[PDB]
C-alpha cells in the first residue's frame, strides 16, 4: 500500500540547519509531483515547496526562497527538504504529500522546533490512586511526564494494547519545559491484577522509559 514516512525533525537553533527526508512506498515514486506542507503550532496549513518529475526541479514559498532546497532521489524513493538559516517562524509540523491535483497522500508529519532552549529529557512519574474509594468497577491510573523539551513525546499504555479509555492531555509549556499527563481507565479486576505500564518516548533526547504502575503502601 501507499505510504509516506518523514524523518529528520527535532530541535534546531535559530540560524542552524536541518534536513528532512520522506520515504515513499506502495507506488511508482518517479511518476508523482511531491510537496512539503507545514503547520505551525495551533495554526493552518501552508505550502512550502514542490518538485515535479520534469527536466527542472522546483517551486518555493517566497519566505523560504534561498533558505530551503527541495530535492528527490528517485532510486531511493525519497523526497528531501534542506532547511538553512532557520527562523522561529519555521517551527512547525512538516508534511510530505504526494498530490495528483491535489494532495491525495500525506505523511504522518515531523515536528521541527527552532529554539535556543536545550534538549531536556522527561521525568516520568507513575500515578497510582491515593484513595481506596475508587475500587472495583473502574480504576483510573495516571502517567505524569514532566520537564521535557522539545515536543513531542509519545505516550502509550502497555505498548499499545491498552488503547480504549485513554486520555493523553496536550502538553503545557512553562519556563522552556513541557509537562503533560495521561490517564487510563481499566476494570478494577485488571489492576493491580495484571501489570499496567506507561511507555514514554522522547526521541529528541533518545529517552525511552517505561513506568509500571504499582499500588501505594
Amino acid at each position: 500500500e501507499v505510504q509516506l514516512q518523514q524523518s529528520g525533525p527535532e530541535l534546531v537553533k535559530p540560524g542552524a540547519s536541518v534536513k528532512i527526508s520522506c520515504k515513499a512506498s506502495g507506488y511508482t515514486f518517479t511518476d508523482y509531483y511531491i510537496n512539503w506542507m507545514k503547520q505551525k503550532p495551533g495554526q493552518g496549513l501552508e505550502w512550502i515547496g514542490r518538485i515535479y518529475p520534469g527536466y527542472g526541479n522546483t517551486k518555493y514559498n517566497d519566505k523560504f526562497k534561498g533558505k530551503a532546497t527541495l530535492t528527490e532521489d528517485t532510486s531511493s524513493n525519497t523526497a528531501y527538504m534542506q532547511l538553512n538559516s532557520l527562523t522561529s517562524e519555521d517551527t512547525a509540523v512538516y508534511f510530505c504529500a504526494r498530490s495528483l491535483t491535489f494532495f491525495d497522500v500525506w505523511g504522518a508529519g515531523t515536528t521541527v522546533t527552532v529554539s535556543s532552549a536545550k534538549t531536556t529529557p522527561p521525568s516520568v512519574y507513575p500515578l497510582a490512586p491515593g484513595s481506596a474509594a475508587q475500587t472495583n468497577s473502574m480504576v483510573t491510573l495516571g502517567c505524569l511526564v514532566k520537564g521535557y523539551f522539545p515536543e513531542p513525546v509519545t505516550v502509550t499504555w502497555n505498548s499499545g494494547s491498552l488503547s480504549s479509555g485513554v486520555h493523553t492531555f496536550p502538553a503545557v509549556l512553562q519556563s522552556d519545559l513541557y509537562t503533560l499527563s495521561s490517564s487510563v481507565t481499566v476494570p478494577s479486576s485488571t489492576w493491580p491484577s495484571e501489570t499496567v505500564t506507561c511507555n514514554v518516548a522522547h526521541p529528541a533526547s533518545s529517552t525511552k522509559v517505561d513506568k509500571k504502575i504499582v499500588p501505594r503502601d
Binding site: 514542490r50 491535489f102 512519574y125 495516571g142 514532566k146 480504549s164 486520555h167 499527563s181
Partner: protein, 205 residues
Amino acid sequence: PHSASGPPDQTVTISCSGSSSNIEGNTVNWYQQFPGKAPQLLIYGKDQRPSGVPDRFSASKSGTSASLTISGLQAEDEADYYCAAWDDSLNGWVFGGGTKLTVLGAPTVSIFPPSSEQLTSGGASVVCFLNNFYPKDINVKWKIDGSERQNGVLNSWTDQDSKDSTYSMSSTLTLTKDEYERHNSYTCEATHKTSTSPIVKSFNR
C-alpha cells in the same frame, strides 16, 4: 463559519470564497484533518469525490464561491475542513483558514497526590482527571487549605473523542516540596453546567 456544532444525522455546510476566479485549470479542493492525523483530501476539481469518501459529501460552486455539503453528519466527520486551490493554478497555492473549529478547555476528575518518587526530587505535583464530559466549557479551581491558587496550574484539553464525542481535561498544580509540606488539604473543584453545585475531590496529608 469558523465553528460548526452539528448533531449526528443533521446536515452541515461549509462555504469558501476566493478573491480571484479559480474555476479555470483545476482547481479547488477540500481537505479534512481529523484530530491527531494528517490532512486528507475529500474533494478535488470542485465536486469530484476521492476514493473512499462517502456519498454523504457533495461539493459545488463556481468562479469565486464554493460550498461543501454533508447531507448527514456522522461521528467520524469531526475535525478540521480546509479549502484550497492549486499551487500551479494561482501560484502560489493557498489554503482557507480554520474549518470553522476552535476551543478550550483542560482537568482532571479523580485527584492524585504527589508520588514519593517526585517528592525526592524536591518537587510536588498534584493532578486533577476530568474525563468524558460535554460541553467542553468547564471551570477548575484549586484550593490549598481552602485558599484558591492560580499560580503554577497547567490545564490541557483533549480534542473531541470520535467514539463518544466527549472531552477530557487534565489539571496539574505544581509546588515545591517545601510549600507542599506546609499545607494539609488540597482540593480540585470543577464547575460544569451538568451540576448545580461544583464537583469536589480532595485529600489531606
